[PDB]
Amino acid sequence: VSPPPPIADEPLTVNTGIYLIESYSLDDKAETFKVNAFLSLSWKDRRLAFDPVRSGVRVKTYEPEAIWIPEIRFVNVENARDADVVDISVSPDGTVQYLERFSARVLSPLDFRRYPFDSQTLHIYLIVRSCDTRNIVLAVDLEKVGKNDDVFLTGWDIESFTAVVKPANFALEDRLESKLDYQLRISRQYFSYIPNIILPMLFILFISWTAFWSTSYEANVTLVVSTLIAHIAFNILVETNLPKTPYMTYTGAIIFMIYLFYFVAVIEVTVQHYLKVESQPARAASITRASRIAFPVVFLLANIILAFLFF
Amino acid sequence: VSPPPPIADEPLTVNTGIYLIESYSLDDKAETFKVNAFLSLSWKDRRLAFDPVRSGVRVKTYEPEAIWIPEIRFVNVENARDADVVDISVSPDGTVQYLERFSARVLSPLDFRRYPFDSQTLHIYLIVRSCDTRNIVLAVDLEKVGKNDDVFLTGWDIESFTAVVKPANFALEDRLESKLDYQLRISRQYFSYIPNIILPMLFILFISWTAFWSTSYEANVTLVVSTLIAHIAFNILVETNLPKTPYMTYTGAIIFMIYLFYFVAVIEVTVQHYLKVESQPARAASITRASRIAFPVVFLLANIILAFLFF
Amino acid sequence: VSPPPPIADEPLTVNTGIYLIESYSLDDKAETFKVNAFLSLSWKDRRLAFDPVRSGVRVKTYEPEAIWIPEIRFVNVENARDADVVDISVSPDGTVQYLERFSARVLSPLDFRRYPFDSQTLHIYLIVRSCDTRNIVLAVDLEKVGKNDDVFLTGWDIESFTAVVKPANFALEDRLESKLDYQLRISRQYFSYIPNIILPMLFILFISWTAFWSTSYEANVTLVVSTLIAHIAFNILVETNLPKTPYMTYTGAIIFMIYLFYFVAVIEVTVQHYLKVESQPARAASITRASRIAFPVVFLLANIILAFLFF
Amino acid sequence: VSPPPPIADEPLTVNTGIYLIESYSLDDKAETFKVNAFLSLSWKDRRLAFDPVRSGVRVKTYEPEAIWIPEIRFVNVENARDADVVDISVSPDGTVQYLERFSARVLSPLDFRRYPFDSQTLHIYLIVRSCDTRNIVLAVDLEKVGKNDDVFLTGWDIESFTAVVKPANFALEDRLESKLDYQLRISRQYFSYIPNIILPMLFILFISWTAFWSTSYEANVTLVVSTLIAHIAFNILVETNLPKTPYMTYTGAIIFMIYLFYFVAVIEVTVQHYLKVESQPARAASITRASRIAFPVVFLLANIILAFLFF
Amino acid sequence: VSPPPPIADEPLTVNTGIYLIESYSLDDKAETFKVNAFLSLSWKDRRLAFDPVRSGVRVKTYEPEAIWIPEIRFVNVENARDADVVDISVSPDGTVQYLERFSARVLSPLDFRRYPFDSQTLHIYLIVRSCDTRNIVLAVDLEKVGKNDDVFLTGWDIESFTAVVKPANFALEDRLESKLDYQLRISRQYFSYIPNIILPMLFILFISWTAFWSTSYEANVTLVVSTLIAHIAFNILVETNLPKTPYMTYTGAIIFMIYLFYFVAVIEVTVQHYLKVESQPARAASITRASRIAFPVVFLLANIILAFLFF
Ligand SMILES: CCCCCCCCCCCCO[C@@H]1O[C@H](CO)[C@@H](O[C@H]2O[C@H](CO)[C@@H](O)[C@H](O)[C@H]2O)[C@H](O)[C@H]1O
Ligand SMILES: CCCCCCCCCCCCO[C@@H]1O[C@H](CO)[C@@H](O[C@H]2O[C@H](CO)[C@@H](O)[C@H](O)[C@H]2O)[C@H](O)[C@H]1O
Ligand SMILES: CCCCCCCCCCCCO[C@@H]1O[C@H](CO)[C@@H](O[C@H]2O[C@H](CO)[C@@H](O)[C@H](O)[C@H]2O)[C@H](O)[C@H]1O
Ligand SMILES: *Cc1c(C)c(=O)n2c(=O)c(C)c(C)n12
Ligand SMILES: *Cc1c(C)c(=O)n2c(=O)c(C)c(C)n12
Ligand SMILES: [Br-]
Ligand SMILES: [Br-]
Ligand SMILES: [Br-]
Ligand SMILES: [Br-]
Ligand SMILES: [Br-]
Ligand code: NA
Ligand code: NA
Ligand code: NA
Ligand code: NA
Q1: Residue of C154, C195, C233 with shortest CB distance to D256
Q2: Ranges in the Periplasmic compartment (chains A, B, C, D, E)?
Q3: Which of C66, C174, C266, C289 is the most buried (most CB within 10 A)?
Q4: C182: number of CA atoms within 13 Å, CB side?
Q5: Is residue D21 within 8 Å of residue D1, measured between CB atoms?
Q6: CB distance A229 to ligand 3 below 6 Å
Q7: What is the number of other CB atoms lying within 10 angstroms of the CB of residue D105?
C-alpha cells in the first residue's frame, strides 16, 4: 500500500463527487449545518489492472486496508466525518471506484445583511495533501454530484448543489494541496417573519400613534411607553435568533429606527402636555396635527430609503 | 465474503422486519424522533446449507464476520444507528435469520398546518445497495413488524406501525437501490394546549372587551394595551415550541387574527375618546353599543371561517 | 463459546442483582433518569467445574471472551449501558459469578396528576432472549440488590429500591424472553414550590382582591390587570418545568381556576364602575360588599373540592 | 496476571495521588464539576523485581496489559474517567510506579443554605474492590497530591486540595472495598451578586416605599404593583441558577420576606385610600406617617434576624 | 518501543507546529473556544535510518504503532483532542515528520473588565513529560506555525496566532516537563452592542427624563417606573451573555450607575409632588428646573470618569 507511480511525470487525478441524502439543522448563531451524503472517489491504479478475457470477472471488490486509497479530508468540518465505506470496485484497466456514506457538521459563514430576506452559499471544501513521491490533484465527476429529491432544510428553500470544477492547487507546509469548492445554494423562507415579528411590531407602533388623537397625557404616556416595552421584547426576541454581526442587518435597521420614532413620539407627547398647562393649547394642537401626518410619512420614506440601501 | 450466487438470474431477496422497543424525543423544531428497536433480516445462502443427520443440530450459529451479511442502511438518520447483533441462526436449507438491536435519531418531516390538533406520519426508510455481481432487493416479513404494548411517545398517541410492502427500486450512483418505508402513525395530545394557551388567551381577549362598558379612556388604554402585551407573550410562547413554516398554522392563524381585534379595539377606544372631547358622547355611545355585539359576533364568525378552512 | 447444556429438561437460571452507586439527573420533561450501578449475574456452567482438593485454588478468574456469558440487556434505556467488567469468579462446582459496573440513561414514564406532591415508581427492566439450543430464565438474588447510603436524587426523596422477584416470561418473535422489573421508589420534595411558586401566586391573587375596597376604576383596572400578567408568568414558569400531559395536574387545575377568579374580578370591577356612572352607587356598593366575602369563600371551597378530587 | 501474593497474611497497599491540571464547569443545578488531572498509583509486585548489575538498567518500563495493575475506580463520576496511561515504572525491588491522565464529570452535593455567600467541599472518591485470592487497601502518598498554580474555577475561589489519609474500608456484596476521600475546598465569589441582584432588588423595594409620601391611590397602586412585578422577575432569575432544595437558602429567605413587605404596603395603600374616601384623612395620615419609619425599621431588624440565623 | 538514545548527554528535541484550519464557538460564560488544526511533530530517531538505494524509496512512511512517537499532550483541553494521523514520514538520517489533524475544546480564561470593548489572548499549551531513560524538550519550528486566511471567529476579529518559542521546562512529580505556549490574539467586535443594548438603554433613560417637564405625578410615576423595568430587562439580558466576575465590567458599571439615576429621579418625582400638595409649587419648580440640567450633566461627567477609569 503506497501511491501508484506516474506513467509520465503528470500528477494523480482523484475524481470526486458528493451526493446529498439528508441536509438538516441550519444553526444561524453557530453558522453551521449538518449533512448526510455519499462521497465518491475515482482514480487509476495500474498495479490493480487485470485481463478481462483471462480473469472472466468484470470487476474486483477490495477492502480499504488491502489497497491504496487517497486521504481526502474536509476543510470546514466541526468534527471529523463519521464515515462508513459502502464500495471499492476495480475495473480491468485498474480504475478504482470508491464510495463512502458520511455525515458531517459543516462550519460555513452566513451573510445576515438582508435577514430575513437572505440567500446563502453554503460550502463543503474537499482537500488532498500530496506526498513526497507524487502530487495528487482533485477533479469533479459531474455525473456523481447531486442531491436526492426529498432533501429539505427546515426554514429554507434549497436552490442548487453544484461543485466548482477547477480545484484550488496551492502549497501549504512545503507540500501540494488540492482544494475543491462544493456549493449548496439556499434561500430563506421569510414567510413566518411577517405574522410573527414584522406585522406585530408595526401594530404596536401604529397604536403608539393613537396618542396623536389624544389630549390625555396620562393615557399617552401609557400608550407610548407600554408599546416601547413590547418593542424591546421583539428586539430581544429577534437578536436571540442571530449572531452578533459587525454590520447592520435589515431587520436590525428597521428595529433601531423604530426606537427613534418612540423617542420623538414621547417628546411630542411631552411638548403637547407642556403647552397645555402653559395655557397654549392652540400651539399644542398645531403640533399634534402635523404629527398625525409627519410620523407615518417620515416612517414610510425612511423605510423606502432602507429597502433601497439593502436591496 | 461475497453475496450468495444466483441459481438462475433472480435478484437476492432480503426479508426485513422492525420491532419497536422504545420511541422517544419527538422534537417539533428539529423534525426528529429517537427510536429503540429490533431489526430482523432473513436471506437464503445455499453455501451455508447443511444435512441435519451428519451435524446433529437443527440450526447453526455464526459470528457476523464469519458469513456474508447484507449492507442494510437507514436513509433518514441524523446519526448512523448504534447497532448490536443479538442472534444469527442458519436453518438446514441455508435460510439465514439475523437479529440486531438498534437505536437511531430519525429525521422525518412534520405538517404543522393543523397544530396542535394534528396527526403525523413518521417514516423509517430501510435501504440496500445492489452489486455488479448481483442485484439485492428488500421485502417485508409482516410477522416481524410491530411494537410492544408499553411503547409510548410523550405528548402523542401512537396509532400504528406498518410497512409499505413494495420496495421502491431505482438507480443511484450507477447501482440499483431497494428502499422500504416503515410508517409510524401518531396524533398529538392537544389536551394541555386548552388550559395553558387557548383558554388563557381567550380570557385576556374577553377582558379587553370590558372597555366597551367603560367611559374611561385612561382605564381603557390600560385594559387594551396590557392584554395586548399578555397576547404578545403567548405568541412568543407558542412560537418557541415550533419551527418556522412557509405556511400558516391553525393556532398561528387564530393568534394573528386576535392582533387585528386588539388594533380595532384601540381604534374604537380612541374614536370614543375623541368624540367625548368634541362634546359628541351620543355618537360615541352608538359606536360603543355596536362594538359590544360586533366584536364577539365577528370573532365567532371568523373562527368558524378558520376552523372550516383548516378542517 | 456456546450455552451450558441442561442436565434435565430445565431452563438455565441467571441470578441477577442491581446495586445503585449513583442516581442523578431526573428530567421530568424527558421522563428519564441517570444511574451508575453494579450488575451482578450468576449461573452454573458444569463445563467449568474443577476439583478444590487437587487444584488447591478455591476460585478461578476468567476474562469475558474465555467463557460463555448470557446476553442480558436493558429494555428501557436511551443511551446503552457503558459497561466494564469488574470480576468473573468460578466456584469448584462451576458456579460463575459475574460483576460489571454500568451507567445508563433510563426512560421511565411519570404520573404528574399530583405535581408537585407526586411520588414515582421508576423502573429498570432486565431482559434475556432464550437460545434455540435452550431457554434462559432470570431470577433475583436479593442478597445482591440494594444501594449505597450516599445515593441522592436532587429534588427527590429515595424511598425504596427493590426488585419484582417473579420475572415476566413471554414469547417475542418466535423466541422466549425473560423480563425482570427493578423498582426505584421516589417521592418529590415539594418544599421549594411553597415559597417560590404557591405563596407568590396567592399574594398577587389577594392583591387583586384589594379592588373590592376601592371605588377607583382606573386603580382597580391596574390592580386586576397587573396581577393577571404576573399570574401568566407563573403559568408559563410552571409549564416550562413539565411535559404536556393528556390530563390535568394538581398545580395545573389551581393555576387554571385562578384565571376564572381574575376574569370574574374584572367583571365585578366593570359592573361596579358602570353603576357608579349610571348614578346607582348603592347597588354597586352592595355587589362590592358581597364580593369581599364571596371571592375568598368560593376560592377556599373550590380548593377543598380540588384537593379532595386529587388526593 | 493475578495480584502479587501475600508474603505474610497482610493486605496489599496501593498508594494513590491526584494532581489537578484543570478544574472547570461547576454546575449548581446538576451539582457537578469537571476535572483534568493526573492519577498516580504505587504498589510492590515482587514477581517483577530485578538486579540492577545483571540487567544493566535501574528502571523497567511495561505496558498495562503486560503486568498486574489494580482496578481503581471513582465512586461519584457521571461519565467514567477518560484515562490514558502516561508511564509504568518498576524499580529493582519491584516497586511499581503508575501514572495516568484522566478527566471526569464528578457528582458531589452542594449546601445552598448560605447562597451566594457559601463555601463548598467537593469530593473525589477513589475505590478498590478486593480479590477472592487477596485483600487490597488504598493509601495516600502526600508527596503526589496537589494542583497546578494556574488552576481556577470560574466564579469560585479555590481554597484547598487535600486527601483524607485514612481510607474507609467496608464490606460490599461480601468483598472488601477500600475508599479514599480527596477534597477540593472552594468558596463562591459573591461579588457580582451585589450590583446585579441584591442592590437592584433593594432599589425597587425602596421605590415602593415612596408611596408613603403620596396621597395619590392611582400612583401608589402603580409604584407597589410595578415594583412587585420586577421582584417576581428577580425571584425567577435567582431560582433559575439553583436546584430545588428541601431547605430555605439565604437569598431565598430575603426574597420571600420581601414579598410580605409588598403585601403589607398594598394593605397600607388600600387602607389610606379607604379612609380618605370616608373623609377620615387625619387617621389615614397617622398610619402613613407610622409606615414611613415602621417599614424601613422592621426591614433592617428582620435582615439582622435572618443574617444571624443563617451565619 | 522506547525513546531514541542520545549520542551525548543532550536531551531529545521535539519540534512543534500548529496550523489553524478552523476556529469557532467562543463561549464567554465557559471561558472556552473550539479549534480544528494541524499538529506537526519532528524528532531524530537514528534507529530508523535507512539506505535509499537499498530500500528503493527516499522517504519511508510508517504507521504510528510501528515506531516510537513522543507523548505530546495538551494542558488546557476540556474535550479530548480528537486526533487523526495524516502522515508519518522518515528520512534516511532518521528524521521523523509527524502530521496529525486535531480538534479540541480549549479552556482559556478571559478578562471581561473592558467588555464589550475587550481583547483576549487565548492559549493552547503543548506539553511533554520526560522519561527516566532520557529527557524530552519541546521546540517551535516557526515555519510550521500559522492559520489559513479564511479562519474566522464569529463575533471577534483575529489579530495573530504565534508561539512563545522558549518552552517552560520545570519539574512535576519528580520528572521533567516541557511546556509550549501558542497564543491566539482576538479583539471583540463591539459593533452590535451599540444598536442592540447601549443606545436602546440610553433612549429609555432619556424617556424617564421627560418627567422633569411634567407636573403630573401619576404620569411621572409611570415614566420612571416603566423605563426602570425595561432597564432591569437589559441588565438581565447583558448578564446572560457573561460569567459572574469577581470584578466590575465596563457595561456592568454603566448598567449599575444608571439604577442610581432611576432612584434619584423617583426621589425628585416624589419631592416635586409632595411640595405641590403642600402648596409650595414654587420650590418644586426650582428643584424640577435644576434637575433638567443636573441629571444630564452628572450623567455626562459620570461616564467620562468611568471611561477614564476603565481605558
Ligand atoms: C420587557 C422585555 C422582556 C424581554 C422579553 C424577551 C423574550 C425572549 C424570549 C427568548 C426565547 C428563547 O428562545 C430563543 O430562540 C430560539 C427558539 O426560538 C432558541 O433556540 C433554541 O431552541 C431549542 C428550543 O427552545 C433549544 O433546545 C436550543 O438549545 C436552542 O437552539 C435560542 O437559542 C433562544 O435564545
Ligand atoms: C407578560 C408575561 C411574561 C411571561 C414571562 C415568563 C417567564 C418564564 C421564564 C422561564 C424560566 C427559564 O426556563 C427554565 O429553563 C431551564 C433550562 O435552562 C429548564 O430546565 C429544565 O430542563 C429539563 C428539560 O430539558 C427539565 O425536565 C428539568 O426539570 C429542568 O432542569 C426549566 O424547566 C425552565 O423553567
Ligand atoms: C431564555 C429565557 C427567556 C425568558 C423570557 C423572560 C420574559 C420576561 C417578560 C417580562 C414582561 C414584563 O412585562 C411588564 O409587565 C407589566 C406588568 O405590570 C406591564 O405594565 C403595565 O402595568 C404597570 C402597572 O403595574 C404600568 O406601569 C405599565 O405602564 C403597564 O404597561 C408592562 O407591559 C411590562 O413592562
Ligand atoms: C457486492 C457486495 C456485497 C453484497 C457485499 O457485501 N460486498 C461488500 O462488502 C462490498 C462493498 C461489495 C461490492 N460487496
Ligand atoms: C487480580 C486482578 C486482575 C488481574 C484484574 O483485572 N482483576 C479482576 O478483574 C479481578 C476479579 C481481580 C482480583 N483482578
Ligand atoms: Br474529514
Ligand atoms: Br444506518
Ligand atoms: Br442494554
Ligand atoms: Br471510574
Ligand atoms: Br491531549
Ligand atoms: Na488503504
Ligand atoms: Na459479512
Ligand atoms: Na463470552
Ligand atoms: Na508509538
Answers
A1: C195
A2: 1-189, 241-248
A3: C266
A4: 28
A5: no
A6: yes
A7: 17
User: Beta-strand (E) ranges in chain C?
Assistant: 12-27, 32-44, 60-61, 72-74, 84-90, 95-107, 119-129, 136-140, 146-147, 156-172, 175-188
Report whether B4 contacts B43 (CB < 8 A): yes
CB contact at 8 A, C11 and C137: yes
Q: Which residues contact A76 (CB under 8 A, 6 or more apart)?
A: A106, A107, A108, A123, A124, A125, E22
What residues of C are in contact with residue D111 (Cβ under 8 Å)?
A: none
Q: How far is E200 from chain D (nearest CA, A)?
A: 19
Q: Are A216 and B273 in contact (CB under 8 A)?
A: yes
Separation of alpha carbons B207 and C64, rounded Å: 70
Of D243, D259, D263, the CB nearest to C154: D243
Q: Distance between CA atoms of C197 and D213, rounded to whole angstroms?
A: 32
Cα separation of C288 and C15, whole Å? 72
Does the domain made of A193-311 have the CATH classification 1.20.58.390?
yes
Contact residues, chain A, for E152 at CB < 8 Å? 109
Q: Which residue reads 418505508 in cell numbers?
A: B181
- The top-level CATH class assigned to B1-192 is mainly beta
C-alpha cell at A16: 470526486
- Search chain A and give the residue with CA nearest E194: A256
Ligand 2 atom index nearest CA of B232: 1
| All three cell numbers of C76 | 428501557
DSSP chain E: --PPPPSSSPPEEEEEEEEEEEEEEEETTTTEEEEEEEEEEEEE-GGG---HHHHS-SSEE--GGGS----EEESSEEEEEEEEEEEEEE-TT-EEEEEEEEEEEEE-----TTTTS-EEEEEEEEEEEPPSS--EEEEE-GGG-EE-TT--BTTEEEEEEEEEEEEEEEEETTEEEEEEEEEEEEEE--TTHIIIIIHHHHHHHHHHGGGGG---HHHHHHHHHHHHHHHHHHHHHHHHTS---SS--HHHHHHHHHHHHHHHHHHHHHHHHHHHHTT-HHHHHHHHHHHHHHHHHHHHHHHHHHHHHH-
Amino acid at D83: A
In chain C, what are the domain boundaries? Answer: 1-192, 193-311
The position carrying cell 431452563 is C11
C285 sits in which H/E element: helix C281-310
Give the span between the Cα atoms of B57 and D47, in whole angstroms. 47
Q: What angle do CA C86, C87, C91 make, to 5 degrees?
A: 170
C-alpha cell at C250: 394538581
Q: How many CB atoms lie within 10 A of CB C230?
A: 21
A237:B236 CB<8 A:
yes
Q: Are E306 and E257 in contact (CB under 8 A)?
A: yes
What is the greatest pairwise CA distance in chain E? 112
Ligand 2: residue whose CA is nearest its atom 24: C29
Chain B interface mutation, best of C72, C234, C244, highest count of B Cβ atoms under 10 Å: C244
